[PDB]
Design a protein around this nucleic acid. Structure first.
Ligand SMILES: Nc1ncnc2c1ncn2[C@@H]1O[C@H](COP(=O)(O)OP(=O)(O)O)[C@@H](O)[C@H]1O
Lengths: 444, 96, 109, 97, 85, 96, 109, 80, 96
DNA sequence: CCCTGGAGAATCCCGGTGCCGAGGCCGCTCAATTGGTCGTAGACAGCTCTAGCACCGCTTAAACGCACGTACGCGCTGTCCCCCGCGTTTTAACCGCCAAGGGGATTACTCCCTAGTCTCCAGGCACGTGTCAGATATATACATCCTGTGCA
DNA sequence: GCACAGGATGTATATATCTGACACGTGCCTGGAGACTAGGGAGTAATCCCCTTGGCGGTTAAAACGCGGGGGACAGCGCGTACGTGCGTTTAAGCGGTGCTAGAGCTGTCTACGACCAATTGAGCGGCCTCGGCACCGGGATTCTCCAGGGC
């Protein structure tokens, strides 16, 4: 009883079934005067659905009101290109650059009022909050809505300060740690409906409450590809130096302030501590692997996988651990590619393109777990090694799906290294609780 | 409910309105004024206690306070402060 | 019956807490006995010093064409006055700056 | 051909500017790292408040400004315009440090 | 097996910062050897003040240094500071 | 016979005989030593009182005295004085 | 009956009067209460400082071929030791004189 | 009385300078030294007289002088 | 006739007076000066001999320290003669 | 243009005098002992807000390295007058001595001023809350350096 | 070799906007005021005698005055060097977030051990005498230094 086919304003393509039904849901949401969250996993055209919604609201309903889209800086060019490609009728402008460019833009394009859609970023919004305050915005779209999940944050406060008539949250994972984040998002959406702080008494009541405010479609509508991932947990034991340092840290000159943060890397590698490594000569020979159980298992596994399918991704939460891994790979004469927070943007693209060549000698790609900008199409890999585990299960899920992309043709192995009788067991238990909460709430 | 913290801010504000009716004062300047009052109080009280100990007494009187004021303040300030304190003591003892 | 309460500050004509001064003197471990007129004298002295500093700071603020006193105005008032400069010689005022002063040999000629 | 001020007019402009302002002239993060390094030698496992480091920075800047004033006076006494470690050491020796 | 040191923390007090302090002091020309001397003087002053502050904190049976401790240390050194309590 | 005056003269003489067994002192030097003892006593006691007020206590203890000697004496003197004072307190606790 | 009186100085093995120090602390308006170990600690510190000064002064008097310590010897001992010089920097010793010291510029070349 | 600062003579000022460790003295040093001595003595005597008046005595005592010197930061050992 | 060079006798006097320990000003003129200065603050004042001696000792020490600092200033100026400018610089750096 | 050779000053070595430090005796008052009690600080439990540790992203001001030119620090020289060493004459400090009286120091007595307690109430402090002063931006007007250029 | 005009730079001045901290209003509770009783501290009077002041005479060391000369202060000159000024590049500071835990401050309770207070006392410590040894004074013979003259 709604738009059953691709609209007329959309050019260069016909919208598929999931996006047309999502557009129908957004139209019904606007008609009923409700703001909602669109969580269509990671890559089934959420941008396309938002663009189609804006085109509908401009054409089929003669309301040319201003619209704002908040996006990460990395996605600005993609958003503008998509706006020019799919719905060229609307006028979309972007605010980027330093003070002179910002002032020139606001004086030339923004203030006169020829624009219809504004595609800015978080930082530019914080810089130009005073200028943006004046307009009476109609539609406020927030890509990667998990950015405002924490109240008392400046972005959330500023975005709530604004004056709007419609809102739309665009996230991939709404629930990450606890229901307070979901309440914050729903408070931004409908402050009147949700104003207080907070399987029939639960689960079902949550589902029936959140159903008219959420629309999620897991990556199973299309499928026909993407062999399922196999996850194996490998348990390792502390080496002698790891055991001694663990006991010394627990009982108690280097400072040990965050004891959990010291126990962590102590599980990763004692070489991260000052003075644990042997003397000044500073050689790299066989006392690096034997001093860490994870290193021993990794040295057993990597040659095996290289004789096997190879193309292994190693995700870690520590750049120091990445340095030690780089030293090990250089000793073993593998090909290591590194992607880190300190890697410049040009180097990132070159590294990913070189690792994704149709025939390349690259074997190990080393990434920081959260350094990815939710892109990085490493579809040529086979094995994902989580050297260290994060509290947030969604971060690990994204690390895994950087190799579980659409272009994948071979099933992926996820090797999760866990130390026995350490704090990593507590970390894994916390992650399991969070993942179970997220599954029972959203995934069902 | 946070604990009670005592300060001279109310009285400094009263004196500010007395001497410059259309004037304000920021919070950091209030902190500076409070610290100044505390420091001067401590100096005068310590000098008076030392005077009492020197003269082998156990009571801090207006004589001790006046002598401490004369010892700590440089000249014109000292004499004007002596006049002010004598006025206050005379008014206090007049009918109270 | 019971007469209405009247503060010693009110009876002395002061804008400072004579009673709080008395309590602080008795709690400060200066002497085992405190006279009745000592808190009055001390309150009057503190009031005079505060009035002097506030008047000078307000004059500085009016010179800078502002109606709120800031630590810069307090520093400008404390300096430029020999009595208060001598009284507060070893005192540092937070973000109070320094007096404008350039030595004559450094001036161009 | 390009415009250039004489060697000393920009210095006088900077003197006037920095004697007109009240801000802190030392970078907060380097100063905090220095403070923590110094506190390491006295007690490991030490934590600081934001007010403590601010007070330390204020006191240090005031001390250095006063020292520089005395150093400039000594340099002028030596019939010079450039301040030197000799002047700094003389000022410290007279002050008793 | 990877290591990389950055710099001495005493070098974080930079030459332009020392120049700004000298400008506020009223200095026109600055010799090139002044900076190391100023760094040493600052280090000595901070060492004294921080030693007194840490002594106060240890007496209070605490592991956190407070602005009160800093103020008391400065008052011990004879450099009373107003504006922090 | 006028009033009685207290001095540390006999104790200073005992210490002198302990240190240099066959040396003497003059009246002026003894007066200087008495003044020094009084001055050091005043400094340490005042600092301990300040510490007690800062921590909102009501008692001066060996911990206050130790903190005061750390604050007032420089370096090696502070270390040796702390060692001697701790020794004395330990012996007095064991023997009482 | 009553046991034989033993001085607290004898119990602590000190040559300085613990009871006198305790009475001076109680009469000095330092705090409401005084602990048992505070007089002992203070007496020990005073004894150590006196011993240090007397030792240095006796050595100086030995170098002067004298058997009595005079203010000149005390001043020499204080000013020739860095720790005691820092402790007594603001102190003038009567009839103590100055250290022999001539700047190298003034010596004949 | 009057004409008493001149009682501090040039040979005495020279002896003080020699104990200070100076070789050559300018001719204008003596009046400057007399002025410095006057200001120092005025401060100390003012404080001592304040102490004596508080004690309600007609005589100025060495203890009063010592107390004045101590409150000026110039502790003197050897007089009480 | 034998005549010493201009500066040898000065060095001899320096060594002699740095070895000695007596007062370098005349006691009766100093006492007259002290009494004259005391006439400004109170009338018919009486003095103990010890009070005048202590005042003279303090004056000697203050002037000796000032002359040392003045000599250092003169040496800094690459001079051997001390000057009122050197004295003023020493006072200003000291804080007076 | 340093090496003897005299003078002048400082230093070691004896011998006689004085006065002050070290010891010894008396008397009193203050510390040691014992007993009793209370209240302060140690110990514990719960809450809430900040600080530390390892990361990521982004923006942009500030540090950094470099080169050129120019005041300036620094050595060097000459001149002159000023301070210094020495001798002579004047002066008042120093020391011993006497004399008189003012005021410091002590004691006895008593009263009145402050500490401590119990009631009672109102003044100050934490908590909300609104709105105006000051910061910031933007565009002119004016005051300052700097240099080239004409001219006597 | 000077004095002025103009250009360029920086700085001061007006105006409009916006925000977050200051100033005000409210409840309540904790500390200040009111009235009263006890007790010891200090005020007052009187006495003693120590110490302070005043005066004098004789020595003599020290200050004042003058002189003759060399050394230091100060002005001028010349140079080559290190610092100021401006510019383009790079770095890291600063701001906004994640994820967790302990530290610290507070409020509120309990409880027990150490410090206060009082009565008795006996030994430690201060004051007064006394005497003998070290410090001091004076005198003589040495060693070192400093200055001048010249044959080095
Ligand atoms: N023309 C298209 N329309 C919709 N989805 C597409 C299109 N082309 C590719 N995709 C899918 O989108 C995924 C990545 O796109 P993404 O940037 O996530 O878009 P969105 O942010 O809209 O989900 C790829 O895995 C690909 O399968």
């Amino acid at each position: 009883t709604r738009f059953e086919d691709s609209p007329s304003y959309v050019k260069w393509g016909k919208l598929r079934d999931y996006q047309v039904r999502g557009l129908n849901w957004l139209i019904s949401l606007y008609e009923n005067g409700i703001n909602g969250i669109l969580a269509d996993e990671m890559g089934l055209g959420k941008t396309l659905q938002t663009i189609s919604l804006l085109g509908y609201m401009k054409h089929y309903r003669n309301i040319p009101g201003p619209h704002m889209v908040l996006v990460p800086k990395s996605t600005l060019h993609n958003w503008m290109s998509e706006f020019k490609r799919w719905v060229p009728t609307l006028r979309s402008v972007c605010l980027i650059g330093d003070k002179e460019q910002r002032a020139a833009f606001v004086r030339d394009v923004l203030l006169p009022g020829e624009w219809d859609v504004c595609v800015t970023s978080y930082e530019m919004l914080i810089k130009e909050k005073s200028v943006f305050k004046k307009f009476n915005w109609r539609y406020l779209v927030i890509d990667e809505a998990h950015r405002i999940k924490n109240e008392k944050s400046k972005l959330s406060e500023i975005v709530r300060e604004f004056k709007t008539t419609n809102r739309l949250l665009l996230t991939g994972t709404p629930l990450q740690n606890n229901l307070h984040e979901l309440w914050s998002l729903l408070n931004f959406l409908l402050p009147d409906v949700f104003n207080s702080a907070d399987d029939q008494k639960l689960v079902e009541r949550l589902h029936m409450v959140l159903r008219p405010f959420l629309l999620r479609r897991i990556k199973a509508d299309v499928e026909k590809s993407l062999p399922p991932k196999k996850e194996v947990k490998i348990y390792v034991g502390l080496s002698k130096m790891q055991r001694e340092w663990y006991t010394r840290i627990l009982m108690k000159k280097m400072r040990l302030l965050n004891i959990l943060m010291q126990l962590r890397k102590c599980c990763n590698h004692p070489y991260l501590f000052d003075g644990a490594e042997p003397g000044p000569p500073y050689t790299t020979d066989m006392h690096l692997v034997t001093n860490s159980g994870k290193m021993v298992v990794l040295d057993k596994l990597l040659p095996k996988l290289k004789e096997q399918g190879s193309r292994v991704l190693i995700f870690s939460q520590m750049t120091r651990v990445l340095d030690i891994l780089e030293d090990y790979c250089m000793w073993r004469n593998y090909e290591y590619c590194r992607l880190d927070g300190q890697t410049p943007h040009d180097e990132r693209q070159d590294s990913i393109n070189a690792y994704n060549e149709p025939n390349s000698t690259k074997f190990v790609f080393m990434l920081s777990t959260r350094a990815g900008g939710l892109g990085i199409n490493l579809a040529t890999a086979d094995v994902v090694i989580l050297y260290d585990s994060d509290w947030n299960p969604q971060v690990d899920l994204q690390a895994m799906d950087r190799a579980h992309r659409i272009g994948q043709t071979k099933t992926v192995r996820v090797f999760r290294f866990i130390t026995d009788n350490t704090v990593e067991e507590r970390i894994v238990e916390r992650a399991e609780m969070k993942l179970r909460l997220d599954s029972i709430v959203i995934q069902q | 409910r946070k604990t009670r913290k005592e300060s001279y801010a109310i009285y400094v504000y009263k004196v500010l309105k007395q001497v410059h009716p259309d004037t304000g004062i920021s919070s950091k300047a209030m902190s500076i004024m409070n610290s100044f009052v505390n420091d001067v109080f401590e100096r005068i009280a310590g000098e008076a206690s030392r005077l009492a100990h020197y003269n082998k007494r156990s009571t801090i009187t207006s004589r001790e306070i006046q002598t401490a004021v004369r010892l700590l303040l440089p000249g014109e300030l000292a004499k004007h402060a002596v006049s002010e304190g004598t006025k206050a003591v005379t008014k206090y003892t007049s009918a109270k | 019956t019971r007469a209405k309460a009247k503060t010693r500050s009110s009876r002395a004509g002061l804008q400072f807490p004579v009673g709080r001064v008395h309590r602080l003197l008795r709690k400060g471990n200066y002497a085992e006995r405190v006279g009745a007129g000592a808190p009055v004298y001390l309150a009057a002295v503190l009031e005079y010093l505060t009035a002097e500093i506030l008047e000078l700071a307000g004059n500085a603020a009016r010179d800078n064409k502002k109606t709120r006193i800031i630590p810069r105005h307090l520093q400008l008032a404390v300096r430029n006055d020999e009595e208060l400069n001598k009284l507060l010689g070893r005192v540092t005022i937070a973000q109070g700056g320094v007096l404008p002063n350039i030595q004559s040999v450094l001036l161009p000629k | 051909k390009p415009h250039r001020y004489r060697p000393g007019t920009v210095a006088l402009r900077e003197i006037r500017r920095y004697q007109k302002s009240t801000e802190l002239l030392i970078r907060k993060l380097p100063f905090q790292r220095l403070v923590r390094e110094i506190a390491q030698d006295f007690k490991t496992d030490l934590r600081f408040q934001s007010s403590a480091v601010m007070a330390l920075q204020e006191a240090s800047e005031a001390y250095l400004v006063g020292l520089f004033e005395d150093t400039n006076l000594c340099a002028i006494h030596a019939k010079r315009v450039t301040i030197m470690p000799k002047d700094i050491q003389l000022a410290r020796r007279i002050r008793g440090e | 097996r990877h290591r990389k040191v950055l710099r001495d923390n005493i070098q974080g007090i930079t030459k332009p910062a020392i120049r700004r302090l000298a400008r506020r002091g009223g200095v026109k020309r600055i010799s090139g050897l002044i900076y190391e001397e100023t760094r040493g003087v600052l280090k000595v002053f901070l060492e004294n003040v921080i030693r007194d502050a840490v002594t106060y904190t240890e007496h209070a049976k605490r592991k956190t240094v407070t602005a009160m401790d800093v103020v008391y240390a400065l008052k011990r050194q004879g450099r009373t500071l107003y504006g922090f309590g």
